[PDB]
Design a protein around this ligand. Structure first.
Ligand SMILES: [Mg+2]
Lengths: 144, 147
DNA sequence: ACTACGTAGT
DNA sequence: ACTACGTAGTT
C-alpha cells in the first residue's frame, strides 16, 4: 500500500485491465473507483482513484478534476461519507498525494493529485452526491 | 480456439486472474466456467473448464472430477439447468472423446492438464430443480499436480 | 443487450 | 454477504 509515485510506473503508462493496476500496486480494487488505507493514527486516507466514465466526473484538459463520490446507485439514495468517500475527505487535511488513473489500452496513469475540497450536491432524484476537487501536483510531466 | 494442449502452457503453470487465461488462449470466457466451439460438423464441443468454487464440484486428489453444469441460479429463484451452450458442449464431448483443458482455482488458478468427459447425469437438488453433473477423468501419462 | 464458476476489500 | 468507475463473446 504505497502512497504517491510507484516504482517503474511512469505518467502516460497504459494498461488494458483493472487487474494490471492491482498487479503493479497502482490501484488495488477490482471494481471500486477509490482505493484507501489506514494512516499512522488509524484514520482512513485515499491512495488512488479511477475515472473511467462510471459517473459524471469533470475531466477537462486542466490541472483540476472533479471526482464524484461512490454509492447511492448512480433505487436512488444518498451517498455516504464512509469508505472511499471518507478516505478522500480525510485526504484533504492529510494533504497526501493520490494516484489518478483515467479511463480511455483502456487506462492511463495521470500522475499525482491533491484533494483540495469536497461538497454535497442534490441530484434530480433528490438524493445526495459528493464531489471532490482534485488538483494535479505541479512539476510533473504532461499527459497528451 | 485450440483443442488440447496450448503452446507454452505447461501443467502446473499458475495464473493470478481469468483474463490471463484468455490472453494465453487457455480459456476464453471472462466469467463462464465452460468454453466451447463448433466442430467440423457444427455441433458444439467443449475446450476447457474452470473449477473455482462457483458450484459444488467434486475435486478430490484423484484422476476423476465431478463438474457441475452451469445455470439454474446455483452459484436468484432456482430453476432447471438446461442442456444448451456449455452444458451441451460438455455432453457432446463425451461422444467426440476430445481433450478438455481443466483449470482449477486456488496466484488463483493452476492448469491441471487434459481430461476426457466420460459421462453426465441429472440430479434433483433440494429446491426441486434439475442440475447436471459431468464426470471427467484425467488423461493418463501426464505430469502430476502437487496437492 | 444478453449470460456468465469475475474479483478485492468491508 | 455485500459493495462496487469490471469484461468477453455472442456460439
Ligand atoms: Mg445469445
Amino acid at each position: 500500500q504505497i502512497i504517491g509515485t510507484v516504482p517503474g510506473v511512469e505518467v502516460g503508462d497504459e494498461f488494458q485491465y483493472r487487474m494490471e493496476l492491482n498487479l503493479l500496486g497502482i490501484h488495488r480494487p477490482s471494481q471500486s473507483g477509490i482505493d484507501y488505507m489506514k494512516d499512522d493514527g488509524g484514520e482512513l486516507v485515499a491512495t488512488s482513484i479511477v475515472s473511467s466514465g462510471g459517473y459524471n466526473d469533470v475531466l477537462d484538459n486542466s490541472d483540476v478534476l472533479i471526482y464524484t463520490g461512490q454509492g447511492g446507485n448512480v433505487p436512488p439514495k444518498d451517498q455516504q461519507l464512509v469508505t472511499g468517500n471518507l478516505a478522500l475527505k480525510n485526504s484533504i487535511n492529510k494533504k497526501n498525494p493520490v494516484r489518478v488513473i483515467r479511463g480511455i489500452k483502456n487506462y492511463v496513469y495521470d500522475g499525482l493529485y491533491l484533494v483540495e475540497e469536497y461538497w454535497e450536491e442534490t441530484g434530480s432524484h433528490g438524493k445526495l452526491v459528493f464531489k471532490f476537487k482534485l488538483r494535479r501536483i505541479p512539476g510533473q510531466p504532461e499527459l497528451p
